[PDB]
């Protein structure tokens, strides 16, 4: 009784098509030559579901208004990818301290990527962990993977050059 329902999008739905295009068009090559996420230029999209949770949405919009009011009515809202072994916990209970990357280069926070292929490196854990649970393959072409495409409030963002 989390309150989360998943609605399947038809591949004929403009909403399915725009989400697939963001997934496919933000693939890049990684400096690890595919060690963490695997070797690929594109995805086979199997399903796109809308995540519906009244409580978690109101939790988001409440915080968004707080940030907006601290930043001249500008939430600075983005659509960004998140890969995690805990995607099931996230869609049911929301993001929290447990989804934080303790060892992250920008501190113990929750990390999001413009590149879908960057988020893909984290589906099986930090640095791809031991890869897919079935084949222990970080480059598995068989096992089904999941990413979240997330609405994120940045507000006033601290610019860190790398």
């Amino acid at each position: 009784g989390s309150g989360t329902i998943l609605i399947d999008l038809s591949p004929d739905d403009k909403e399915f098509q725009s989400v697939e295009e963001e997934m496919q068009s933000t693939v890049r090559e990684h400096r690890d030559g595919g060690h963490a996420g695997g070797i690929f230029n594109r995805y086979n999209i199997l399903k796109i579901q809308k995540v519906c949770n009244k409580k978690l949405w109101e939790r988001y919009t409440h915080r968004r208004k707080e940030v907006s009011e601290e930043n001249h009515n500008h939430a600075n809202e983005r659509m960004l990818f998140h890969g995690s072994p805990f995607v099931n916990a996230i869609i049911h209970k929301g993001f929290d301290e447990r989804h934080a990357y303790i060892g992250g280069m920008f501190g113990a926070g929750i990390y999001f990527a413009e590149n879908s292929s960057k988020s893909n490196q984290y589906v099986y854990g930090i640095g791809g962990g031991t890869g897919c649970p079935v084949h222990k393959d970080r480059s598995c072409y068989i096992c089904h993977r999941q990413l979240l495409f997330c609405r994120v409030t940045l507000g006033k963002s601290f610019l860190q050059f790398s």
Partner: protein, 46 residues
């Protein structure tokens, strides 16, 4: 979980690699909503 830099709500990791896009960090779970769950396979290059 750490705090945002004082006077900030998030961090932007600006990409050496001219082709890399930005990474972002929030320090409040409430600042993200998981809108879409995408199920996929990576494809072996031809």
């Amino acid at each position: 979980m750490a705090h945002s830099p004082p006077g900030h709500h998030s961090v932007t990791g600006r990409p050496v690699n001219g082709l890399a896009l930005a990474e972002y960090v929030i320090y409040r779970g409430e600042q993200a909503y998981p809108e879409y769950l995408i199920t996929y396979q990576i494809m072996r290059p031809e």
